[PDB]
Amino acid sequence: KDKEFQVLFVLTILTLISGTIFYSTVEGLRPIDALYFSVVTLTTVGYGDFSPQTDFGKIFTILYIFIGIGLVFGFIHKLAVNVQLPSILSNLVP
Amino acid sequence: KDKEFQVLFVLTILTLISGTIFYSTVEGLRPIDALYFSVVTLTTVGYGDFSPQTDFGKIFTILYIFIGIGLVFGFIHKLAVNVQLPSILSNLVP
Amino acid sequence: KDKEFQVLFVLTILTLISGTIFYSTVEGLRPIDALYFSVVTLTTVGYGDFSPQTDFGKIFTILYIFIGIGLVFGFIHKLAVNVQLPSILSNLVP
Amino acid sequence: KDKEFQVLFVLTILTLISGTIFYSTVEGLRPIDALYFSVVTLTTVGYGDFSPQTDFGKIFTILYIFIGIGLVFGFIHKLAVNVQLPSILSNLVP
Ligand SMILES: [K+]
Ligand SMILES: [K+]
Ligand SMILES: [Tl+]
Ligand SMILES: [Tl+]
Ligand SMILES: [Tl+]
Ligand SMILES: [Tl+]
Ligand SMILES: [Tl+]
Ligand SMILES: [Tl+]
Ligand SMILES: [Tl+]
Ligand SMILES: [Tl+]
Ligand SMILES: [Tl+]
Ligand SMILES: [Tl+]
Ligand SMILES: [Tl+]
Ligand SMILES: [Tl+]
């Protein structure tokens, strides 16, 4: 639980590393924009201020979403259950 | 349940207060636009009519999403289960 | 189950009726655009091809999302479980 | 489980085939853009770089979302549980 959250954290980090490199290189975004876009994509926000322009970028984004969404939201949840909720409940009492 | 919903309500309010101040100040949005954007972000709608323009805004938005999504949707759900569904079911019968 | 799906269906319909009237009137959208926008909003797609321009539209959209998201996705799910999955499984065998 | 994932995979594929043909034809998108848009829609990302322009496209998109969202996310999850998580856990040990 405290130990499992560390697994999803690495996996998420690795997923975002992959998107940051792909979109910097193929779509030509600055690395910070590429990471931002990767996060905005896999959390399903999708502002569209960055969006792939090339057919290679679109095909990767299809695959990137299907693979990553399940992971990322897995991490958000465990962060919610096993890391966020404790601190909350511990602040309720002295 | 009636008591827990009040916890998530405050926490959500505090999360949206934080986004409203950050985006008003760093991204220069009117306070109402900043709150609207914060809500549109953390519910994962993401119209993109407002989107951060500065690197500081993008880095904060990455962190803001990961922290807040789990909270907000937690509140939507409890609102659904413990506050919305009762009124519905009570209207079914006299 | 077959009976409960009918409840969420009406409630969803009523939620979308409300958005269709509000956005037609306050934001000035054609009624079909207003319904489309209401659906695109409460399912959290959020293309942003329509987005509220007035402060009244933004305040309503904040409230509309928090109230409706929980409902709508409730209906999508029951449609998935109690109406979509049966037909699927019945087609598996003669 | 290994067998059920194959069911959702076909159904998802068929759902995306339908969107690819509809949006190519009615909205006039290149087939690759149409598939990309279908995926970006049903995963609720919604960049809005493509969005339907015709009333027929908007009405279909309303129905397409309500029908498909439940399916697609069903597939993402099973992919997460029954296909993604194993490989993860098997890499943990030799
Ligand atoms: K946009
Ligand atoms: K735009
Ligand atoms: Tl945008
Ligand atoms: Tl941009
Ligand atoms: Tl979304
Ligand atoms: Tl979006
Ligand atoms: Tl937009
Ligand atoms: Tl704006
Ligand atoms: Tl958008
Ligand atoms: Tl747009
Ligand atoms: Tl428009
Ligand atoms: Tl979205
Ligand atoms: Tl866009
Ligand atoms: Tl386009």
Topology:
The structure is a homotetramer of 94-residue chains.
Chain A: H1 2-25, H2 31-42, H3 55-92
The structure holds potassium ion (2 copies) and thallium (I) ion (12 copies).
Count of folded domains of chain A: 1
Based on CA inertia axes, which overall geometry of chain A fits?
Answer: elongated
By CATH reckoning, the class of chain A would read Mainly Alpha
Proportion of residues in extended strands of chain A: under 5%
CATH architecture of chain A: Orthogonal Bundle
PDB class: membrane protein
Keywords: Potassium ion channel, membrane protein, thallium ion, Tl+
Assembly: tetrameric
Entry title: Crystal structure of a K+ selective NaK mutant (NaK2K) -K+,Tl+ complex
Descriptive overview:
- It is classed as membrane protein.
- Keywords: Potassium ion channel, membrane protein, thallium ion, Tl+.
- Four copies of one chain form a homotetramer.
- The first copy, chain A, has 94 residues and is mostly helical.
- Chain A has a single domain (2-88), classed as Helix Hairpins.
- Helices cover 79% and strands 0% of the residues of chain A.
- Chain A has three helices and no strands.
- Chain A has helices at 2-25, 31-42, 55-92.
- In chain A, α1 packs antiparallel against α3.
- The longest helix of chain A is centred in the C-terminal third of the chain and has 38 residues, at 55-92.
- Chains in contact: A-B, A-C, A-D, B-C, B-D, C-D.
- The A-B interface holds A 32-33, 35-36, 39-40, 43-49, 76-77, 79-80, 84, 88, 92 and B 7, 11, 41, 44-48, 51, 55, 58-59, 61-62, 65-67, 69-71, 74.
- The site of one thallium (I) ion has 3 residues of chain B, from loops.
